[PDB]
Amino acid sequence: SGFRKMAFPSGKVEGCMVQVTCGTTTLNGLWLDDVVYCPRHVICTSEDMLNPNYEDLLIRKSNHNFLVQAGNVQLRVIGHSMQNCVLKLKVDTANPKTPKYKFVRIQPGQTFSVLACYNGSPSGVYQCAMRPNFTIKGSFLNGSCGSVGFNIDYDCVSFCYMHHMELPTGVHAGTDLEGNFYGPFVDRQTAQAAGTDTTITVNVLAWLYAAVINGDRWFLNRFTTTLNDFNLVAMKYNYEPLTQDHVDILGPLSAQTGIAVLDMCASLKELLQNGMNGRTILGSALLEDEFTPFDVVRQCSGVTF
Amino acid sequence: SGFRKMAFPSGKVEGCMVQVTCGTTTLNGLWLDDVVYCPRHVICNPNYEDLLIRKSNHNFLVQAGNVQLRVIGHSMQNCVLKLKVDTANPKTPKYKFVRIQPGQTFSVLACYNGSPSGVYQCAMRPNFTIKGSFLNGSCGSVGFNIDYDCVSFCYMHHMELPTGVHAGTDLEGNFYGPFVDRQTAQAAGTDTTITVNVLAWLYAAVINGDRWFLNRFTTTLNDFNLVAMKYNYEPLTQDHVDILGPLSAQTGIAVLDMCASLKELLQNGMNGRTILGSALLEDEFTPFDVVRQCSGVTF
Ligand SMILES: CNC(=O)c1ccc2cncc(NC(=O)Cc3cccc(Cl)c3)c2c1
Ligand SMILES: CNC(=O)c1ccc2cncc(NC(=O)Cc3cccc(Cl)c3)c2c1
Ligand SMILES: [Cl-]
């Protein structure tokens, strides 16, 4: 029993964090095998950030300009290349702590753990979700660039995010581990703003199923809805449209609790109309959208209370 | 910017998790140096000395990864069993066993079959329970904090109470709260809100640009405690006021001025608004957690 925002154990990722220095800029890098991955903006000055020509800035650098520190040891850079917005620094030592890993690009609504780092040293771990507007609501200070997002399914670490910048609203933007940004963002100091954000509907439904599994049914009602009528109501509350894929994905939780997806959709509609009336659901007074259907099955029991 | 419920990096603790089996019971153990610590209920009116005297070293199966450790001794200390093994854990970090007080926070590395599955942050409630997330097999999972490079172990999981909340001991086997390790009618007492932690979280909200709840008013400590007692909030002591000193100096809001904001929040509610993305007053961040997360201390 109980339902917490749970992050994956960070040990496999902590053993990959290094510090990358180029000139006066210091940020974090991910050391996997003999390559250190970091944001390419490490080669920039604050002036260069308005309209950097990364190719022009990189051609002027040599291997010895990049200082890489792993713990108290200085690694030797023997090569460098750029792939999209990530810089790949070839080093002369393979990381003996390299876990089994993959680089995966996630979709909005997916969750992941973040190991926030400063000067190549891990400071904290938290759980978060890729918002529908492609930003993340993280907790990052100056020096956190290069910190990574990941999932650990079995013994394999799937790296899905590398932190690059903070937008004016305090939200964060970054890339996958191949250097492709999530969202319409660029690694430039230019007028960029996060688009209007929406609630991840399929995740709120999964979280309502987690509440039913843990014994809470106060919010259920005798109604059902069509998918179309649910979406017409949902979009008036800035909720993402619920697709037939989402309904299919909620199938296992529907079978376990005995509540049809469109029946749970009707309880969500009523919650949006009435509010909570002083009550809570899993210790929260708001509808939670940062637990996927997969997170709920992983964390919750297989037997409904 | 941003404020998340953040746990300490769990790597130093993951390297200590092992699986302990005795008969049909499997749970988690903490392997430090040549000793494995685990709940004594792994041997299960349980007369634990009578049950332990009947066991031999080879009855305890200890598995570290894919390796079977050899148990060469066993002893009980309060509600924890200490299994002496032949091999010292080469991954043993610098550590201490510390007992925490209600209101203090810690990270939990939830484990099943000696394998870590998740990490979360939580607080020791004033009623000595923890609102954790634990399933069957989680017994022996540990709570900890990190100070520089030293892991301070403060909690070991033992049981779930009927309300879904959890109970456990420090690493010396002393329970937090009036609980016993047996299947008997036990219930968590009435809980209260950790006042000093709510105030620290209000200061974190101000640091992150959320100021709608501030007002021109102040209060006395006595008047605040009379009001706080009415809403099932823990009393605020002069020690708590002193501990909030740094945050008061940084934001320019006196502790008793922030108390007048909290009094107005309790009497009138949030009025449809949120603070740091929450519609409830959050009490699981200490004044130290707020300073650490708004400064970037590393481990
Ligand atoms: C003193 N605080 C900060 O400057 C600060 C706070 C918080 C921050 C959180 N994350 C990243 C930071 N860094 C950047 O956004 C640097 C940057 C600027 C323009 C474009 C690009 Cl790609 C990268 C933060 C920076
Ligand atoms: C049916 N649910 C479970 O089996 C369950 C679910 C969830 C659980 C979460 N944590 C621990 C469990 N374990 C215990 O509380 C076993 C126990 C019983 C009597 C005394 C003592 Cl000291 C320990 C859980 C057990
Ligand atoms: Cl995905």
PDB file of C-alpha atoms and ligand atoms in Angstrom, chain A residues 41 49 54 140-142 144-145 163-166 172 181 186-189, chain B residues 1, ligand 1:
ATOM      1  CA  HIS A  41      26.885  25.016 -25.717  1.00  0.00           C
ATOM      2  CA  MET A  49      24.761  32.486 -27.278  1.00  0.00           C
ATOM      3  CA  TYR A  54      28.718  25.878 -33.509  1.00  0.00           C
ATOM      4  CA  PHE A 140      17.773  22.962 -11.852  1.00  0.00           C
ATOM      5  CA  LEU A 141      20.199  25.714 -10.883  1.00  0.00           C
ATOM      6  CA  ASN A 142      23.161  27.209 -12.820  1.00  0.00           C
ATOM      7  CA  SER A 144      23.134  21.633 -13.956  1.00  0.00           C
ATOM      8  CA  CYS A 145      23.520  21.553 -17.781  1.00  0.00           C
ATOM      9  CA  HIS A 163      19.465  19.099 -19.794  1.00  0.00           C
ATOM     10  CA  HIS A 164      20.416  22.190 -21.857  1.00  0.00           C
ATOM     11  CA  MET A 165      18.470  25.284 -20.696  1.00  0.00           C
ATOM     12  CA  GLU A 166      15.901  27.058 -18.556  1.00  0.00           C
ATOM     13  CA  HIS A 172      13.381  23.340 -18.681  1.00  0.00           C
ATOM     14  CA  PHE A 181      15.818  18.806 -28.899  1.00  0.00           C
ATOM     15  CA  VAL A 186      17.158  25.908 -30.017  1.00  0.00           C
ATOM     16  CA  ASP A 187      20.385  26.160 -27.973  1.00  0.00           C
ATOM     17  CA  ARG A 188      20.488  29.955 -28.541  1.00  0.00           C
ATOM     18  CA  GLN A 189      19.746  32.940 -26.271  1.00  0.00           C
TER      19      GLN A 189
ATOM     20  CA  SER B   1      14.287  27.393 -10.745  1.00  0.00           C
TER      21      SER B   1
HETATM   22  C1  LIG C   1      22.153  32.189 -12.121  1.00  0.00           C
HETATM   23  N1  LIG C   1      21.168  31.269 -12.657  1.00  0.00           N
HETATM   24  C2  LIG C   1      21.163  30.910 -13.940  1.00  0.00           C
HETATM   25  O1  LIG C   1      21.772  31.545 -14.797  1.00  0.00           O
HETATM   26  C3  LIG C   1      20.447  29.643 -14.286  1.00  0.00           C
HETATM   27  C4  LIG C   1      19.474  29.132 -13.419  1.00  0.00           C
HETATM   28  C5  LIG C   1      18.891  27.924 -13.655  1.00  0.00           C
HETATM   29  C6  LIG C   1      19.251  27.155 -14.788  1.00  0.00           C
HETATM   30  C7  LIG C   1      18.721  25.867 -15.050  1.00  0.00           C
HETATM   31  N2  LIG C   1      19.067  25.113 -16.085  1.00  0.00           N
HETATM   32  C8  LIG C   1      19.961  25.617 -16.946  1.00  0.00           C
HETATM   33  C9  LIG C   1      20.561  26.873 -16.831  1.00  0.00           C
HETATM   34  N3  LIG C   1      21.396  27.428 -17.818  1.00  0.00           N
HETATM   35  C10 LIG C   1      21.032  27.982 -18.995  1.00  0.00           C
HETATM   36  O2  LIG C   1      19.858  28.143 -19.340  1.00  0.00           O
HETATM   37  C11 LIG C   1      22.192  28.389 -19.881  1.00  0.00           C
HETATM   38  C12 LIG C   1      21.791  28.614 -21.321  1.00  0.00           C
HETATM   39  C13 LIG C   1      21.331  29.853 -21.749  1.00  0.00           C
HETATM   40  C14 LIG C   1      20.856  30.028 -23.042  1.00  0.00           C
HETATM   41  C15 LIG C   1      20.822  28.960 -23.923  1.00  0.00           C
HETATM   42  C16 LIG C   1      21.293  27.735 -23.496  1.00  0.00           C
HETATM   43 CL1  LIG C   1      21.183  26.361 -24.562  1.00  0.00          CL
HETATM   44  C17 LIG C   1      21.797  27.553 -22.222  1.00  0.00           C
HETATM   45  C18 LIG C   1      20.214  27.673 -15.695  1.00  0.00           C
HETATM   46  C19 LIG C   1      20.797  28.935 -15.413  1.00  0.00           C
END
